[PDB]
Design a protein around this ligand. Structure first.
Ligand SMILES: CC(=O)N[C@@H]1[C@@H](O[C@H]2O[C@H](CO)[C@H](O[C@H]3O[C@H](CO[C@@H]4O[C@@H](C)[C@H](O)[C@@H](O)[C@H]4O)[C@@H](O)[C@H](O)[C@H]3O)[C@H](O[C@@H]3O[C@H](CO)[C@@H](O)[C@H](O)[C@H]3NC(C)=O)[C@H]2O)[C@H](O)[C@@H](CO)O[C@H]1O
Ligand code: NA
Ligand code: NA
Ligand code: NA
Length: 599
């Protein structure tokens, strides 16, 4: 019986105290230790070599204890380790083995979940150094890594990166790198107070599946000029995504460098999230260099129902090539998003845009294969002073993009800078249902609303519809002579255009092409013959050999005659129509006409 007291006070004591659930005689006859063994926390590994519990704190490195916990739970086939609430657990050294090649702190393991209720902080050992806090690779070479499966990080807790700046721009810093990750997720967690490259990365070069980031917060994760680049979540495996997250930055640097999400593989999504203070919303890109695990195509890409205040571009599309692989981007939907460029000076951050068709990382604009994109049902706003704002900046080759039923209220609709790239454009469709706002009315001196600074345009549709006047603009749409135009439809609705000197401008007279379908308003001077009765009127200019019909947009202030309501052309490039002289006499009028070709 001395034995007994001793057994009870020993670490095996709970293993000697019997228990049966709710006194139910049909329940298992267990011991207390069995029931306690159904859960596990960091406290069960956070101890010195004699087994005495160690209190966490800024002078204690909790890393080895958390790794021991993960290692042990993995050995039993998995479970969930709680990181207790009411404590801050500091990490103060690098991990060892396969994660050392990734500057890893903690190695995640398959089927071992982390329920983070307390706080995890980085100690100043990490100041000016690279780190990846949680790493799912098991090898320094990702190509030689095994997988991470069934690993979930969740809870009301916090990962705090200590505020430390990067030491050098070439360093990398990450929160969670799941690795070659299958059915992994982060839910509920706040990531805050750092200068990092990513908070979370999913997958590796297409290897992984079913990874998600849901109801997380990312707060103030760029803080220095050293930080080369930041994207909060990088989605690098298919069938994966980001939903219902919150992203906020306060740094000036973040306005120029930070992006919320990147979607880099097929069947990926970014939904229902709120962004503030970032340069960019999402990249949707197929990099050939990342094509190993899931193929060379990024398809079924979804960006929907987000709310954003950004300083650069909302969605950026891309694809590129390596020596032996070609990347393609297709079957994309961008819908339901409400986005604005935040208050800033013109040209003070990267050029503002809803959609950007961007060149590759080496600036090449002739490698892209981007098509079958639908942009529908979004709003975009930029304040009136922001000259550098567009619905699309089309800066690299485009094989198709469709715009239906958006509301764009910014400086430009379509833009590319002249004397830069000369993109080859196919299948650009701008439906009439896109509503062009008026915030930038009167700011457009010298500017074309649709500034078609391309090598060529084919199989494209631009149906311009104004909803207010802006007589400051040079034109609604302009094609330089260097842009070929063919098999396209270009129209300018007449509403709010009566007073415009130029509506559509074709500097190479490209509207004469055999398969160009156009219509736009123009002012035309006409003279008639002197005959009483039905009498022809003819334009004084001869630049209408391309016109198939025209009709009056002007009232007739005369009693004694009327000009033709409608006109055809003649071989010499005059317009001609049949009007009516009640009394004879040569007539001379200026009239606003709708000029039409093959429409
Ligand atoms: C910040 C960001 O995401 N920017 C986007 C561009 O990403 C490219 O540039 C970034 C710059 O940070 C990344 O390149 C850096 O990192 C890679 C990868 O790090 C190695 O492999 C890790 C698995 C490992 O843990 C590390 O220890 C490193 O060994 C490095 O190779 C580059 O030298 C370095 O500049 C990014 O790389 C991808 O990163 C994701 C997420 O971690 C990985 O899954 C991919 O495997 C990496 N891809 C490649 C080809 O290596 C670069 O792809 C991006 O291109 C553009 C367009 O979408 O947008 C930027 O915002
Ligand atoms: Na590495
Ligand atoms: Na509106
Ligand atoms: Na050209």
């Amino acid at each position: 019986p001395d034995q007994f007291r001793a057994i009870i006070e020993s670490p095996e004591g709970a293993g000697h105290v019997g228990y049966q659930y709710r006194r139910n005689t049909g329940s298992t006859m267990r011991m207390v230790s069995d029931v306690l063994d159904e859960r596990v926390s960091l406290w069960d590994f956070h101890c010195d070599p004699s087994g005495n519990v160690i209190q966490p704190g800024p002078n204690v490195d909790s890393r080895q204890y958390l790794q021991a916990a993960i290692d042990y739970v993995s050995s039993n086939g998995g479970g969930t380790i709680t990181i207790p609430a009411g404590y801050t657990w500091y990490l103060g050294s690098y991990g060892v083995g396969g994660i050392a090649g990734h500057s890893g702190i903690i190695q995640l393991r398959s089927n071992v979940n982390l329920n983070i209720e307390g706080r995890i902080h980085l100690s100043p050992f990490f100041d000016l150094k690279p780190f990846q806090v949680f790493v799912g690779f098991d090898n320094g070479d990702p190509a030689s890594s095994g997988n991470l499966e069934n690993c979930h990080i969740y809870g009301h807790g916090v990962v705090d990166f200590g505020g430390y700046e990067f030491g050098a721009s070439s360093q990398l810093r990450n929160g969670v790198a799941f690795g070659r990750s299958y059915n992994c997720s982060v839910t509920g967690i706040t990531f805050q107070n750092g200068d990092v490259t990513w908070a979370i990365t999913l997958g590796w070069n297409g290897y992984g599946s079913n990874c998600y980031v849901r109801k997380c917060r990312f707060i103030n994760l760029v803080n220095s000029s050293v930080n080369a680049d930041h994207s909060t979540v990088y989605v690098n495996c298919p069938y994966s995504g980001v939903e219902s997250c919150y992203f906020s930055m306060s740094s000036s640097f973040a306005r120029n460098i930070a992006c919320s999400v990147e979607l880099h593989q097929h069947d990926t999504f970014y939904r229902g999230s709120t962004v503030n203070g970032y340069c960019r919303g999402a990249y949707v890109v197929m990099h050939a260099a990342e094509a190993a695990g899931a193929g060379s195509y990024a398809y079924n890409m979804q960006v929907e129902n987000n709310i954003a205040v950004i300083y650069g571009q909302f969605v950026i599309l891309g694809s590129d090539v390596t020596a032996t692989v070609s990347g393609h981007l297709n079957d994309v939907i961008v819908s339901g998003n409400i986005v604005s460029i935040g208050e800033r000076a013109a040209f003070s951050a990267p050029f503002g845009a809803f959609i950007d068709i961007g060149p590759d990382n080496s600036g090449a604009s002739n490698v892209q294969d981007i098509q079958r994109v639908l942009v529908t049902g979004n709003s975009f706003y930029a304040p009136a002073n922001i000259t550098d704002s567009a619905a699309i900046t089309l800066r690299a080759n485009l094989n198709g993009c469709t715009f239906i039923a958006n509301n764009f209220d910014c400086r430009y609709m379509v833009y590319n800078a002249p004397g830069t790239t000369s993109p080859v454009v196919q299948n650009l469709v701008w439906d009439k249902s896109n509503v062009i706002g008026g915030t930038h009315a009167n700011q457009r001196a010298g500017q074309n609303l649709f500034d078609m600074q391309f090598a060529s345009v084919v199989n494209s549709t631009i149906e311009v519809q104004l909803s207010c006047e802006d007589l400051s603009m040079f034109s609604c749409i302009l094609f330089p002579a260097s842009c070929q135009l063919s098999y396209s439809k270009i129209t300018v609705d007449s509403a709010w255009t009566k007073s415009m000197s130029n509506t559509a401008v074709f500097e190479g007279n490209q509207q004469a092409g055999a398969n160009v379908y156009v219509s736009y308003p123009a002012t035309v001077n006409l003279t008639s013959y002197n005959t009483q009765g039905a009498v022809p009127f003819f334009s004084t200019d001869t630049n209408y050999a391309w016109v198939t019909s025209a009709y009056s947009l002007s009232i007739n202030e005369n009693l004694d005659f009327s000009p033709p309501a409608t006109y055809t052309n003649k071989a010499n490039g005059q317009l001609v129509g049949v009007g009516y002289n009640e009394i004879g006499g040569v007539r001379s009028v200026s009239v606003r006409l709708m000029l039409q070709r093959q429409v």
